[PDB]
Ligand binder design. Structure first.
Ligand SMILES: [K+]
Ligand SMILES: [K+]
Ligand SMILES: [K+]
Ligand SMILES: [K+]
Ligand SMILES: [K+]
Ligand SMILES: [Mg+2]
Ligand SMILES: [Mg+2]
Ligand SMILES: [Mg+2]
Ligand SMILES: [Mg+2]
Ligand SMILES: [Mg+2]
Ligand SMILES: [Mg+2]
Ligand SMILES: [Mg+2]
Ligand SMILES: [Mg+2]
Ligand SMILES: [Mg+2]
Ligand SMILES: [Mg+2]
Ligand SMILES: [Mg+2]
Ligand SMILES: [Mg+2]
Ligand SMILES: [Mg+2]
Ligand SMILES: [Mg+2]
Ligand SMILES: [Mg+2]
Ligand SMILES: [Mg+2]
Ligand SMILES: [Mg+2]
Ligand SMILES: [Mg+2]
Ligand SMILES: [Mg+2]
Ligand SMILES: [Mg+2]
Ligand SMILES: [Mg+2]
Ligand SMILES: [Mg+2]
Ligand SMILES: [Mg+2]
Ligand SMILES: [Mg+2]
Ligand SMILES: [Mg+2]
Ligand SMILES: [Mg+2]
Ligand SMILES: [Mg+2]
Ligand SMILES: [Mg+2]
Ligand SMILES: [Mg+2]
Ligand SMILES: [Mg+2]
Ligand SMILES: [Mg+2]
Ligand SMILES: [Mg+2]
Ligand SMILES: [Zn+2]
Lengths: 24, 206, 98, 80, 60, 155, 127, 118
RNA sequence: CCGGGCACUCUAACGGGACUGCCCGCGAAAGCGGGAGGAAGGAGGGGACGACGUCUGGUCAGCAUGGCCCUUACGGCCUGGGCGACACACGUGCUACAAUGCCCACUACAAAGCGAUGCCACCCGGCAACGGGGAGCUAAUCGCAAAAAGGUGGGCCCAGUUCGGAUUGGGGUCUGCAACCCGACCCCAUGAAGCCGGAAUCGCUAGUAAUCGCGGAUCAGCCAUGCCGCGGUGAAUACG
């Protein structure tokens, strides 16, 4: 869920970017 | 613990800022500090003249500083040397090299800060607080002033127990936005402690 | 083609000064396209009322910067006559580019 | 999963002290108020007193202790 | 706001990060707004006094 | 509602069948304020009501709701040092509310894997007089009238 | 030749231009159903026409900005009614009982201090 | 079939299957299936013997897995404790090693809650 | 996007508008019920605004301040540690326990705000955090920026799992003199409890609840899931 650092929604909730939430 | 500051409440309508100037985010705090030092040095000097207010305006590297005083004869001095010394100390404080004006206050009893200052003086001289208040309200009411109120805080008469002495008359409609009430506050430093003094004066409406 | 930006905390003084500039530039110059409002920049400060605890009191303040436009076409030299310096307002700040 | 960066940090108080000892020998101990300093190989075989905020603890240092800070071996808190 | 801690103002903090902000008026450490250089209490006080230009009570 | 009479909310008509009852059901299906997903669910369910029952899903739905409506129900009252379960009639609005709510609940109690299937099946079952909703209605109408002795506490 | 209306819902505006024709609708250059559709409420935006039995009489060129797509649907619903009124004023008499020309004044309630959101109060124990 | 030690995943996607391997998470399985040229979507029961041999070839020795992994971790902690590090003390007492508050929570590390008098 | 133009949208100053003013009924009147016209009626919605006083309420640790007390220390500088301790108990919250769901890909609509020792388009390296280079922006003109839920397609198939991401091992990035005590972030491995919660108990009456993202103050960095705001979707029920 939102608590999973390794998920899209996780990065979104944490407000970061990375491998699982690219900057396009 | 209620009743927000009436001046601060009416600042948009029927009240105006004492410091009126524009500045950016990198400017503001500095000009503000400066203003505060100006008001500071001026309150610690011109008190004997009974300053009811100090307005401060700026354009570019220049400052208005319009001082509203009950007795301008004090701030001017003999031949006008006092005002020179004050512009001097002002220039030594801030290097902006700015000007100064003196506005005489008509009927010192209609500007709340002066009223509160008088009541406070009386309290510090060990006057009778109840009578001092009733008298002050009387002097305020007898000249114009569609309403008036004065409030003194705890340790009245040096009493061990703090009290509040009230004594107001006329109309003081604090909740009315269009009111235009003057508010003022004075302290009293006594041997037994500190006394707060508030003054409300309701003059005209719309 | 002269860029002007008027900024102030009081919209009354802004409007008055802007229309003053406009009337100054109307007689000496072109049609004076006139002040375009531009958005306000509003900065808020939320602060607890009391000096101690009581977290649920607050009462925030706002500080708003109003803007104006001007931009007179036909930069006549005759215009800078009524222009340059004649103004009432204090807390109005003027920006000028070419 | 720790990290610092390139250009590893060691306080130069004892950095010079340890090699100054190494030059002429081993000698005895040291007393260090800097626990933030990283342990580097040249300190192996020495003994360093680390300030835990109260006293100095005699930490002997071996090959497998390298890379950790001094303070890891000098516990600050007293419990049960 | 102890008088010695107003050594806060220092030309030589010895480290940039050791340099912290205080209230220029009352000397408060916590809750100091960068824009005014003041603290929240002093801010509300001076606001109510009308000595902060453009600052008005907000409602919407 | 201490002061006023608390007037009823008028719900917009259905986008498909123009029935406000449909809309009410759509709302009771709705979760976390997702209306779109709820409309999806219900309409998909209607598509499931055919090729099972040749009839129009509206009729089935309305009759199911009709069968889930309780005539009587029980409600607590404090009388002379005790607490009694008192039987009494159900206002038509409450009949509708309870019927729909029960339909949805019972539907989501079902074994069927995905939503529209559960709603369609519960609806069909209720229409023919069986299923969890009807079980609730029967249970309540049994509770009331089991308590007949207390019907003089009506109020 | 062309009949205009605006309409507004919940911080959303839509320009509505009614130009007589086949009855096809354009939204922001996209087809009407390419913008919507996956939105079930969509057809409600076209409710005014169906109310006056207009439909395939006018085409419509719409420009929507602000809000989410539902509020956009409603703002379109108003705009079409307004343009429809500009076309024939008598239409008002038909359109009013349904209230399509009613602007919906409901907006997000401002969040308030001490609360969580504008209403919702922080829960407490007392024990 | 039998990949990288004693574990056999079955009857579901090969990536998700490889997840049942100890040293292998989602990412490593994705990578392995990529470099082994195997479609992830195929069920394990549908895996060509050749594909299984190739998968074994890659996965078994590239990364250290299973038993050797657990032994490596255990040896890491053992080393941490032996040197007398703070981390080692936290492991010793069975308290959070990563610097979290113990006044409340920290239950996962401390296991069940053992209550006493007030 | 260029010419071109203020009609519309918007922007922000001023102004109009609604008063039980008009119709029916009841009423002595105030007013009440309903209807018309209207964007809105009967206080249209939401703020600011909180009487005489009560709690010997809170705060001398924001400031001021009477008294009392310390003045080679009850003052002052610095290094280090502590405010982060943990058998335990409570409050407030976050994430969940899944299919009205989770994951991946493509794709669509917002408001309010911040930005020059700043925001950082775009190019290269890197799986990524990020690093190098570098345009624009004194900012309705550049950037933060992606809104998310939503839609389309595909995968999962009811299992403690492609639910849930605690815990722990390892390798890193950045801020900062410095991340051991004690920062955040990335990547690999690990993959806990948790299957909707006892007695008890909380909020909310409409764009509300519920749910989804977004911004900002403080700030080098950040333990922010806190707070103060913003918009998206959008209920149930009120006999009494
Ligand atoms: K959720
Ligand atoms: K556990
Ligand atoms: K109002
Ligand atoms: K008291
Ligand atoms: K529950
Ligand atoms: Mg997961
Ligand atoms: Mg007296
Ligand atoms: Mg309050
Ligand atoms: Mg490095
Ligand atoms: Mg002091
Ligand atoms: Mg700092
Ligand atoms: Mg500070
Ligand atoms: Mg009643
Ligand atoms: Mg049930
Ligand atoms: Mg909301
Ligand atoms: Mg595994
Ligand atoms: Mg700790
Ligand atoms: Mg009032
Ligand atoms: Mg007390
Ligand atoms: Mg106390
Ligand atoms: Mg603390
Ligand atoms: Mg203990
Ligand atoms: Mg013990
Ligand atoms: Mg961009
Ligand atoms: Mg790249
Ligand atoms: Mg533009
Ligand atoms: Mg899908
Ligand atoms: Mg799908
Ligand atoms: Mg799993
Ligand atoms: Mg279990
Ligand atoms: Mg399950
Ligand atoms: Mg239990
Ligand atoms: Mg209960
Ligand atoms: Mg209410
Ligand atoms: Mg920050
Ligand atoms: Mg932490
Ligand atoms: Mg945030
Ligand atoms: Zn202060």
């Amino acid at each position: 869920g939102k608590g999973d650092r390794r998920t899209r929604r996780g990065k979104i909730w944490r407000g970061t970017y990375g491998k699982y939430r690219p900057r396009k | 613990g209620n009743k927000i500051h009436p001046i601060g409440f009416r600042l948009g309508i029927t009240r105006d800022w004492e410091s009126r100037w524009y500045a950016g985010k990198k400017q503001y705090r500095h000009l503000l500090l400066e203003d505060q030092r100006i008001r500071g040095l001026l309150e610690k000097e011109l008190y004997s003249a009974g300053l009811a207010r100090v307005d401060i305006e700026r354009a570019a590297d220049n400052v208005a500083v319009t001082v509203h005083v009950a007795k301008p004869g004090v701030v001017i001095g003999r031949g006008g040397e006092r005002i020179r010394v004050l512009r001097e100390e002002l220039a030594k404080l801030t290097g902006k090299n700015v000007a100064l004006n003196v506005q005489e206050v008509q009927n010192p009893n209609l500007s709340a800060p002066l009223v509160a200052q008088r009541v406070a003086e009386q309290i510090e001289r060990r006057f009778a607080v109840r009578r001092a208040i009733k008298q002050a309200v009387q002097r305020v009411m007898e000249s114009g002033a569609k309403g008036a109120k004065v409030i003194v805080s705890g340790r009245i008469g040096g009493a061990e127990q703090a009290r509040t002495e009230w004594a107001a008359q006329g109309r003081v409609p604090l909740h009315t936005l269009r009111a235009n009430i003057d508010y003022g506050f004075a302290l009293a430093r006594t041997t037994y402690g500190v006394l707060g003094v508030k003054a409300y004066i309701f003059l005209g409406e719309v | 083609k002269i860029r002007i930006k008027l900024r102030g905390f009081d919209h009354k003084t802004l409007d008055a000064s802007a229309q003053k500039i406009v009337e100054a530039a109307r007689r000496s110059g072109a049609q004076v396209s006139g002040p375009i409002p531009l958005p306000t920049r509003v900065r808020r400060f939320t602060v607890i009322r009391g000096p101690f605890k009581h977290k649920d009191s607050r009462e925030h303040f706002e500080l708003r910067t109003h803007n104006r436009l001007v931009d007179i076409i036909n930069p006549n030299r005759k215009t800078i006559e009524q222009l340059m310096t004649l103004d009432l307002p204090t807390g109005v700040e003027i920006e000028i580019k070419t | 999963p720790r990290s610092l960066k390139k250009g590893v940090f060691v306080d130069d108080h004892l950095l010079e002290k340890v090699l100054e000892l190494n030059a002429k020998g081993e000698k005895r101990l040291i007393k260090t108020w800097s626990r933030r300093s990283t342990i580097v190989p040249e300190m192996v075989g020495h003994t360093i007193a680390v300030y835990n905020g109260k006293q100095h603890v005699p930490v002997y240092i071996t090959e497998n202790m390298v890379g950790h800070k001094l303070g890891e071996f000098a516990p600050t808190r007293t419990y049960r | 706001a102890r008088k010695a801690l107003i050594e806060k103002a220092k030309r030589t903090p010895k480290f940039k990060v050791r340099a912290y902000t205080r209230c220029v008026r009352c000397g408060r450490a916590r809750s100091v707004y960068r824009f005014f250089g003041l603290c929240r209490i002093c801010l509300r006080e001076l606001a109510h006094k009308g000595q902060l230009p453009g600052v008005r009570k907000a409602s919407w | 509602a201490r002061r006023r009479r608390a007037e009823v909310r008028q719900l917009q008509p259905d986008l498909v069948y123009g029935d406000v009852l449909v809309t009410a059901f759509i709302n009771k299906i709705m979760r976390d304020g997702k209306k779109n997903l709820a409309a999806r669910i219900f309409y998909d369910a209607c598509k499931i009501i055919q090729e099972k029952t040749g009839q129009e899903p509206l009729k089935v739905f309305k009759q199911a709701v009709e069968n889930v409506k309780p005539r009587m129900e029980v409600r607590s009252r404090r009388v002379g040092g005790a607490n009694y379960q008192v039987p009494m009639e159900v206002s038509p609005r409450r009949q509708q509310s309870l019927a729909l709510r029960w339909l949805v609940q019972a539907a989501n109690q079902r074994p069927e894997r995905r939503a529209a299937v559960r709603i369609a099946h519960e609806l069909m079952d209720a229409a023919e007089g069986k299923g969890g909703a009807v079980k609730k209605k029967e249970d309540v109408e049994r509770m009331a009238e089991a308590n007949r002795a207390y019907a003089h506490y009506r109020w | 030749e062309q009949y205009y209306g605006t309409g507004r819902r919940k911080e959303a505006v839509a320009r509505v231009f009614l130009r007589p024709g086949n009855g096809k609708v354009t939204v922001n250059g996209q087809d009407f159903n390419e913008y919507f559709q996956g939105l079930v409420r969509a057809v409600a935006a076209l409710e005014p026409l169906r109310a006056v039995d207009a439909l395939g009489h006018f085409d419509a060129y719409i420009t929507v900005r602000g809000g989410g797509k539902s509020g956009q649907i409603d703002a379109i619903k108003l705009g079409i009614a307004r343009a429809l009124v500009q076309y024939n004023p008598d239409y008002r008499a038909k359109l009013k009982p349904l209230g399509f020309l009613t602007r919906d004044a409901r907006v997000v309630e401002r969040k308030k201090y001490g609360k969580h959101k504008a209403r919702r109060a922080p829960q407490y124990s007392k024990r | 079939a039998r990949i990288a030690g004693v574990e056999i995943p079955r009857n579901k996607r090969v990536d998700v299957a490889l997840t049942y391997i100890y040293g292998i998470g989602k990412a490593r399985a994705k990578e392995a299936l990529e470099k082994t040229g195997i479609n992830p979507a195929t069920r394990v029961k549908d895996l060509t013997e050749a594909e299984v041999v190739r998968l074994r070839e890659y996965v078994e020795n590239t990364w250290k897995l299973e038993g050797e992994l657990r032994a490596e971790v255990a040896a890491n902690i053992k080393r941490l404790m032996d040197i007398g590090c703070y981390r080692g003390l936290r492991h010793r007492r069975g308290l959070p090693v990563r610097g979290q508050r113990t006044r409340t929570n920290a239950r996962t590390r401390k296991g069940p809650r053992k209550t006493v008098a007030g």
